[PDB]
Amino acid sequence: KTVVVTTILESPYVMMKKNHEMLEGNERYEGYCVDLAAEIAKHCGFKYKLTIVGDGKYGARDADTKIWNGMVGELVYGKADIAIAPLTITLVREEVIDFSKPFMSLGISIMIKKGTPIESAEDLSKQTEIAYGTLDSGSTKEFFRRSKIAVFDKMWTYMRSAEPSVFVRTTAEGVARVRKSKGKYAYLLESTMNEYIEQRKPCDTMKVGGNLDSKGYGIATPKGSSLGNAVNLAVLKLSEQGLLDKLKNKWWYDKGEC
Amino acid sequence: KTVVVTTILESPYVMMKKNHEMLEGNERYEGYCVDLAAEIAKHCGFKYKLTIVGDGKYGARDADTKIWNGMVGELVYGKADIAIAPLTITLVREEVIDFSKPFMSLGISIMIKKGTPIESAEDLSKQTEIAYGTLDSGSTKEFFRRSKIAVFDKMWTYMRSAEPSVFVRTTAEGVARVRKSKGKYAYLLESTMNEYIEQRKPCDTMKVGGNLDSKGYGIATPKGSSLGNAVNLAVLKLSEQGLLDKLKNKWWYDKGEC
Ligand SMILES: NC(=O)CN1CCCC1=O
Ligand SMILES: NC(=O)CN1CCCC1=O
Ligand SMILES: NC(=O)CN1CCCC1=O
Ligand SMILES: NC(=O)CN1CCCC1=O
Ligand SMILES: N[C@@H](CCC(=O)O)C(=O)O
Ligand SMILES: N[C@@H](CCC(=O)O)C(=O)O
Ligand SMILES: [Zn+2]
Ligand SMILES: [Zn+2]
Ligand SMILES: [Zn+2]
């Protein structure tokens, strides 16, 4: 049987290739997670089809219906067999799906347009001129929603009520908002994506401050899946081979333009 | 049943209190892992007893006898229920014990005496004047033994045949050797321990270069243990609440001496 893999279009994890129109199936895509999927499948010995998550989301639980959306939902409701994406290992997700040991470390970070007078999260929290937000239906938004840290709690109070809305539907929308806003919008996103974007033309954004937290991405499977054990061992093996480091260099710094 | 916890005397994870001979049971010890153990136990709702691993080792499998030593062995052979220590998540260990998601990120790093003319592993590998080694029966030694990367295998070829032995039995032994060798010994050890020592008097050592790899410490349980699930959720909860960050600040930097 062919394993259905859910993933998400997010650079440089999964991107449409330049010449995709004349390519078919898995071939249409390239990126870190596309390379990772291929080695996972080889080591675990399965065939697979990459599918882009229908609703374009990572995954959160609707507070009223309790229904999961995004890639998490696809796993939970049996629409996909595995998710290979920059999907953050969190407590609420671990309660409903299984994660491999992390294949990448990261933390929440701040993206500004170059020249913006912001140096830290505390800086953002102490002013009103510069608006800031995060991605909808992701782990970053939940981080701020839940934080008991005075700075982050204060930021959340501001974000949850801001007008117009400071939240975005995709990372691309967030980055575009930063770029178009003349330094009046800052974007809270994962350090991995931040570091990638900082090295791509037009080279007008910057990661500022340290990471706000430390966590990891994992490969996710439905709870009790026959795949979970093999996938976990494969991640550890690839880590120890140095393959994960190699892929990181290939997609982040070999592809730098600035 | 009172949960038997195996750990290791390694600063600042587990250290004897000043007045330990007048104290009883868990109260004899202090440190990052002693603090973390108390929190894990409270969140999972179990009573526990801290015990120091008899052989003072982390854990490796003897190639001849095939017997696991150290903390790993305590779990494999049923002498302890859980290990709470700076125990690295590795593939060969994961094949015989279970790990939680990591509670700390780290990588192999280089410790030099200040002023030593070394900036990288590449530097080390290309010279002979300065000796270098690692801890016995640990994940760092196995990293070099198993590596297929040219620089690291060149280093392994040197270390395995160096005389006198460049390997040490404890982290403290390694650090003392650096401090006493007038710049002629460099020590390969995890960035966490390197960072801690750098902040301790006499303030004569330094971490140089980037990390050689990226991995994590996990809380370990015997394979298939019923504690595994609860412990993993507790680590993720404490991570998200920021407890782990607070503990690292407390034991590394708040106490800094340099
Ligand atoms: N982004 C990364 O390189 C993650 N890696 C690399 C090696 C091991 C690991 O967890
Ligand atoms: N208080 C902290 O040090 C928080 N940090 C810094 C780096 C990563 C992380 O979680
Ligand atoms: N290793 C991870 O993916 C996340 N981390 C890093 C340190 C502590 C933690 O929970
Ligand atoms: N090729 C690399 O970037 C290797 N590194 C650097 C830091 C951590 C790690 O595994
Ligand atoms: N990696 C995140 C998405 C990006 C973000 O929330 O900043 C997740 O799994 O939800
Ligand atoms: N954390 C390591 C010990 C220290 C080292 O090997 O550098 C282990 O679990 O083996
Ligand atoms: Zn097209
Ligand atoms: Zn491979
Ligand atoms: Zn709703």
Same CATH fold, A107-215 and A1-106+216-255?
yes
Task: Find, in chain A, the residue whose alpha carbon is nearest to that of B145.
Answer: A240
Q: Which amino acid is at B55?
A: D
For the A1-106+216-255 domain, the top CATH level (class) is alpha beta
Residue position matching structure tokens 């002023």 = B115
B189-218 residues touching A, CB cutoff 8 A? 213-216, 218
Structure-solving method = X-ray
Amino acid at A196: Y
- Confirm or deny that B93 is annotated as ligand binding: yes
For chain B, domain boundaries: 1-106+216-255, 107-215
CA B130 distance to own-chain centroid:
24
Residues 6+ apart with CB under 8 A from B23: B17
Token pair, residue A57, equals 């989301």
Closest by CA position to A59, among listed A173, A167, A146, A137: A137
Is A218:A139 a contact under the CB 8 Å cutoff? no
Residues 225-244 of A with CB under 8 A from B: 232-233, 236-237, 239-242, 244
Residues with CB under 6 A from ligand 2: A 107, 210-211, 213-214; B 245, 249
B95 chain-A contacts, CB cut-off 8 A: 233
Say how many Å lie between the CA of residue B102 and the centre of ligand 8: 23
What amino acid occupies position A212?
Answer: L
Residue range B107-215, CATH number: 3.40.190.10
Buried b / exposed e along A24-51 (16+ C-beta atoms within 10 A): eebebbbbbbbbbbebbbebbebebebe
* Contact state of A236 with B149 under an 8 Å Cβ cutoff: no
CB-based contacts of A24-27 (< 8 A; 24+ apart in sequence): A25/A49, A25/A50, A26/A50
| Ligand 6 site, residue B140, Cβ cutoff 6 A | yes
The residue of A43, A44, A94, A98 whose CB has the most chain B CBs within 10 angstroms, and thus the best one to mutate to test that interface, is: A94
- Give, rounded to a whole angstrom, the gap between the first and last alpha carbons of chain B: 44
User: What CA–CA distance (Å, rounded) separates A189 from A180?
Assistant: 17
Cα dist. A76→A53, A213, B101 in Å?
A: 13, 27, 21
Strand partners, A104: A217
- Resolution value, angstrom units: 1.9
Angle, helices A32-44/A228-241, rounded to nearest 10 degrees: 120
